[PDB]
Scaffold this active site. Structure first.
Site, PDB file in Angstrom:
ATOM      1  N   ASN A  43       9.982  -1.587   5.104  1.00  0.00           N
ATOM      2  CA  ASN A  43       8.794  -1.597   4.271  1.00  0.00           C
ATOM      3  C   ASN A  43       9.075  -2.465   3.043  1.00  0.00           C
ATOM      4  OD1 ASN A  43       6.920   0.877   2.324  1.00  0.00           O
ATOM      5  ND2 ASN A  43       6.269  -1.063   3.235  1.00  0.00           N
ATOM      6  N   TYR A  76      -3.176  -5.856  -5.557  1.00  0.00           N
ATOM      7  CA  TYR A  76      -2.420  -4.620  -5.647  1.00  0.00           C
ATOM      8  C   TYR A  76      -1.984  -4.357  -7.084  1.00  0.00           C
ATOM      9  CZ  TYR A  76       1.855  -1.722  -4.955  1.00  0.00           C
ATOM     10  OH  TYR A  76       2.847  -0.776  -5.015  1.00  0.00           O
ATOM     11  N   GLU A  85      -2.381   4.010  -7.893  1.00  0.00           N
ATOM     12  CA  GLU A  85      -1.909   2.839  -7.168  1.00  0.00           C
ATOM     13  C   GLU A  85      -3.146   2.406  -6.393  1.00  0.00           C
ATOM     14  OE1 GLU A  85       0.753   3.459  -3.780  1.00  0.00           O
ATOM     15  OE2 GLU A  85       1.781   1.586  -4.271  1.00  0.00           O
ATOM     16  N   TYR A  87      -5.544  -0.785  -4.189  1.00  0.00           N
ATOM     17  CA  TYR A  87      -5.551  -1.997  -3.380  1.00  0.00           C
ATOM     18  C   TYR A  87      -6.957  -2.491  -3.064  1.00  0.00           C
ATOM     19  CZ  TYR A  87      -1.192   0.411  -1.964  1.00  0.00           C
ATOM     20  OH  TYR A  87      -0.017   1.098  -1.963  1.00  0.00           O
ATOM     21  N   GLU A 176       2.332  -7.312   2.055  1.00  0.00           N
ATOM     22  CA  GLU A 176       3.129  -6.149   2.417  1.00  0.00           C
ATOM     23  C   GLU A 176       3.452  -6.210   3.890  1.00  0.00           C
ATOM     24  OE1 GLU A 176       2.510  -3.870   4.878  1.00  0.00           O
ATOM     25  OE2 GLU A 176       2.900  -1.843   4.211  1.00  0.00           O
TER      26      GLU A 176
END
Length: 189
Positions: A43, A76, A85, A87, A176
């Site tokens: 990740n 982001y 958080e 997006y 990502e």
């Protein structure tokens, strides 16, 4: 070509993070450009932008995005008090990153309808260490790897849905990857 971390390069804030699984090469280029090439990564999230971001920034980006497995391209960032958080997903490969999240509504912005979601992150990493916080999502239906994002459209949409944003921390256009392969080159402005 750098290792995970945060800093500034050619006038832009940059952030690169990964779980310690190899297979990722992240490179800062001239201006607001960055390139990421990955092969069987774990990740990771990396990109360029601003620190701090604003609640009305119009973000421009253009590039090539070719994922082979779980991955996404999106605006982001974070906010504090409350710790959020968020997006604004412009593109993704294989799996919608909003999967499992609770859909709140939809917003039409920058030439497309976006699906809005909210979900809780429990005891996960964050800009202030392992913590529990909410993630806000806006996923673009018409996937693209270039264009302009009026962040104010999404924040106002989220607010109308009862989602509140605190003081903005950084804000970037990031690529990502999650246990997949692929490559990308993005120029932010």
């Amino acid at each position: 070509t750098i290792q995970p971390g945060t800093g500034y390069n050619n006038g832009y804030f940059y952030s690169y993070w990964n779980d310690g699984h190899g297979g990722v090469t992240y490179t800062n280029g001239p201006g607001g450009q960055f390139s990421v090439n990955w092969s069987n990564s774990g990740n990771f999230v990396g990109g360029k932008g601003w620190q701090p971001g604003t609640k009305n920034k119009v973000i421009n980006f253009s590039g090539s995005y070719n994922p082979n497995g779980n991955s996404y391209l999106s605006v982001y960032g974070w906010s504090r008090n409350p710790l959020i958080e968020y997006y604004i997903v412009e593109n993704f490969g294989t799996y919608n990153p909003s999967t499992g999240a609770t859909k709140l509504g939809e917003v039409t912005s920058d030439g497309s309808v976006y699906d809005i979601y909210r979900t809780q992150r429990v005891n996960q990493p964050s800009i202030i260490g392992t913590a529990t916080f909410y993630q806000y999502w806006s996923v673009r239906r018409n996937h693209r790897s270039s264009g302009s994002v009026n962040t104010a459209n999404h924040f106002n949409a989220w607010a109308q849905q009862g989602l509140t944003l605190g003081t903005m921390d950084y804000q970037i256009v990031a690529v990502e990857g999650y246990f997949s392969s692929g490559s990308a080159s993005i120029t932010v402005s």
